[PDB]
Write an enzyme that holds these catalytic residues in place. Structure first.
Site, PDB file in Angstrom:
ATOM      1  N   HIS A  95       1.651   8.962   1.077  1.00 37.35           N
ATOM      2  CA  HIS A  95       0.849   8.804   0.108  1.00 37.35           C
ATOM      3  C   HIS A  95       1.824   9.615  -1.421  1.00 37.35           C
ATOM      4  CE1 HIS A  95      -1.767   6.562   2.778  1.00 37.35           C
ATOM      5  NE2 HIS A  95      -0.963   7.955   3.674  1.00 37.35           N
TER       6      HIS A  95
ATOM      7  N   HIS B  54       1.078  -1.251  -0.209  1.00 41.46           N
ATOM      8  CA  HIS B  54       0.185   0.266  -0.221  1.00 41.46           C
ATOM      9  C   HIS B  54       0.680   0.799   0.525  1.00 41.46           C
ATOM     10  CE1 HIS B  54      -3.564  -2.497   1.144  1.00 41.46           C
ATOM     11  NE2 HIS B  54      -3.260  -2.987   1.933  1.00 41.46           N
TER      12      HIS B  54
ATOM     13  N   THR C 263      -5.882   6.452   7.668  1.00 45.78           N
ATOM     14  CA  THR C 263      -6.927   7.020   6.391  1.00 45.78           C
ATOM     15  C   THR C 263      -6.562   5.689   5.913  1.00 45.78           C
ATOM     16  OG1 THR C 263      -4.455   7.455   5.236  1.00 45.78           O
ATOM     17  CG2 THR C 263      -5.915   8.854   6.685  1.00 45.78           C
ATOM     18  N   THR C 264      -6.484   4.943   6.036  1.00 47.91           N
ATOM     19  CA  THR C 264      -6.924   3.237   5.671  1.00 47.91           C
ATOM     20  C   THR C 264      -7.119   2.157   6.271  1.00 47.91           C
ATOM     21  OG1 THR C 264      -4.181   1.924   5.760  1.00 47.91           O
ATOM     22  CG2 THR C 264      -3.879   3.412   4.434  1.00 47.91           C
TER      23      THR C 264
ATOM     24  N   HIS D 204       5.280   7.676   6.399  1.00 45.14           N
ATOM     25  CA  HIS D 204       5.250   6.761   4.845  1.00 45.14           C
ATOM     26  C   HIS D 204       4.710   8.032   4.658  1.00 45.14           C
ATOM     27  CE1 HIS D 204       2.168   5.860   6.909  1.00 45.14           C
ATOM     28  NE2 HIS D 204       1.085   6.668   6.056  1.00 45.14           N
TER      29      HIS D 204
ATOM     30  N   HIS E 175       3.117  11.062   6.699  1.00 51.57           N
ATOM     31  CA  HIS E 175       2.583  10.824   7.753  1.00 51.57           C
ATOM     32  C   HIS E 175       3.885  10.215   8.676  1.00 51.57           C
ATOM     33  CE1 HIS E 175      -1.170  10.594   5.773  1.00 51.57           C
ATOM     34  NE2 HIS E 175      -0.952  11.209   6.207  1.00 51.57           N
TER      35      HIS E 175
ATOM     36  N   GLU F 123      -3.338  13.678   0.759  1.00 50.91           N
ATOM     37  CA  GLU F 123      -4.526  12.973   1.638  1.00 50.91           C
ATOM     38  C   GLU F 123      -5.419  14.432   2.013  1.00 50.91           C
ATOM     39  OE1 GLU F 123      -3.462   9.215   3.654  1.00 50.91           O
ATOM     40  OE2 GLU F 123      -4.134   8.035   2.091  1.00 50.91           O
TER      41      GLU F 123
END
Ligand SMILES: CNC(=O)Nc1ccc(S(N)(=O)=O)cc1
Ligand SMILES: [Zn+2]
EC number: 4.2.1.1
Length: 257
Positions: A93, A61, A195-196, A91, A116, A103
């Site tokens: 996004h 992911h 958020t996942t 990590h 994040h 995000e």
């Protein structure tokens, strides 16, 4: 299994994770004119000098840079937080194009990526217990825009070839996350979620106002990663972001005027 494709992406997550439609979901759009300065918010305290990075993992992911969180070595305190929150991993996004990837958004603006830095509240003893609590996590979010290179990101960029596919990891010691911060620690804050999946409503979000700049070459290397495992059809790891969710009964507070 959940992901970011047409048939398993964010619009599908609620079927396995009904909290996806909950009351404090993340990310959100930060309307800068409606966020209210809260003079009772204290300066953030980011104490990363003793950070011990260990490993970098492609989890299918994103990629996580993991830290030793068995002692108070790299901690976040202050701001909206009560107590001490230990850094466990960071990590990102990011998008397939420079015009999307973050995000959170700011007055509906999407950044090219979002970092994040994930921390858990030490009063709950471990990360798995912390995610079951409404004040279990503090995630420090930092926007990335494309421009000049970020020198402190390059060591991350250069190891990505060794973790191209899901399930691959590599040693990643002596990485200093202070090199990923912007100059200012001015921030917005609100109560939200992971958020996942599992989308647990356990996060105090702290989103910095000042983005960092990364180079086009740096983000292009993020986009060479794969969602798939080795020996599976190649699917580029891009657009691994959840869009903004309804703010509902929440106020976003600003640390700055
Ligand atoms: C071991 N599980 C784990 O770290 N889950 C996790 C942490 C953080 C976030 S995010 N995108 O809200 O920062 C999402 C999922
Ligand atoms: Zn994240």
């Amino acid at each position: 299994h959940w992901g970011y494709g047409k048939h398993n992406g964010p619009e599908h997550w609620h079927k396995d994770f009904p909290i996806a439609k909950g009351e404090r979901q993340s990310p959100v759009d930060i309307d800068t004119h409606t966020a209210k300065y809260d003079p009772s918010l204290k300066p953030l305290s980011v104490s990363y000098d003793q950070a011990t990075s260990l490993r970098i993992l492609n989890n299918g992911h994103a990629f996580n840079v993991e830290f030793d969180d068995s002692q108070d070595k790299a901690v976040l305190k202050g701001g909206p937080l009560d107590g001490t929150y230990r850094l466990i991993q960071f990590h990102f996004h990011w998008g397939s194009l420079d015009g999307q990837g973050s995000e959170h958004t700011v007055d509906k603006k999407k950044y090219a990526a979002e970092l994040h830095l994930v921390h858990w509240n030490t009063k709950y003893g471990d990360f798995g217990k912390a995610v079951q609590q409404p004040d279990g996590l503090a995630v420090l979010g930092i926007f990335l825009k494309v421009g000049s290179a970020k020198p402190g990101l390059q060591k991350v960029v250069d190891v990505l070839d060794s973790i191209k596919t899901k399930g691959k990891s590599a040693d990643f010691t002596n990485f200093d996350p202070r090199g990923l911060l912007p100059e200012s620690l001015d921030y917005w804050t609100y109560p939200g979620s992971l958020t996942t999946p599992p989308l647990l409503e356990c996060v105090t979000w702290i989103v910095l106002k000042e983005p960092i700049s990364v180079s086009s070459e740096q983000v292009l290397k993020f986009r060479k990663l794969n969602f798939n495992g080795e020996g599976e059809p190649e699917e580029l790891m891009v657009d691994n972001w959840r869009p903004a969710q309804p703010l509902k009964n929440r106020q976003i507070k600003a640390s700055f005027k």
